[PDB]
Amino acid sequence: MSAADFEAAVAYVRSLPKDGPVQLDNAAKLQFYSLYKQATEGDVTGSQPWAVQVEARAKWDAWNSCKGMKSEDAKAAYVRRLLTLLRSQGIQWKPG
Template identity: 35%
Template sequence: MSDIDARFTQAQTDVKKLAERPGNLTLLRLYALYKQASTGDAHGDKPGFADLAGKYKYEAWAALQGTSQDDARRLYIELVESLKSGASA
């Protein structure tokens, strides 16, 4: 396992142990970065109007199209670290 993979796995554990629940926009960013890092570019059908949460998640993920999986991992790690230090909410 490479260093970036190990740090990404650790960040996934750390995000579950945050003292405060992040705001909705931060949660969307975490979701999108996680999906991009683990799956790559968004694929599949975009959820319809009736699934508002699914639609926002898909759009956040699709906005990262073209971002490499390693770059998404690094951004995810940085965001989790900033949340741990209290710099973001």
């Protein structure tokens, strides 16, 4: 598996049901969000959200923490994080 499997990894995460076999805590969701944005859009854009927008601000800050990361490195990190998260829940992943 490589950065070429990024889209399969994203599709898998998008497909996960709410209370299904894979559990994503806030940390994992923020890691996937930030690496996804870094992989697809590059460095963080725009102004920092207001703190009262807790989730929006957390997402933007997480993306900001990825600045300087090459898009292919963000793609690889996303797939690696999916594989590691699934392994921590007794699941082996393969695209498809």
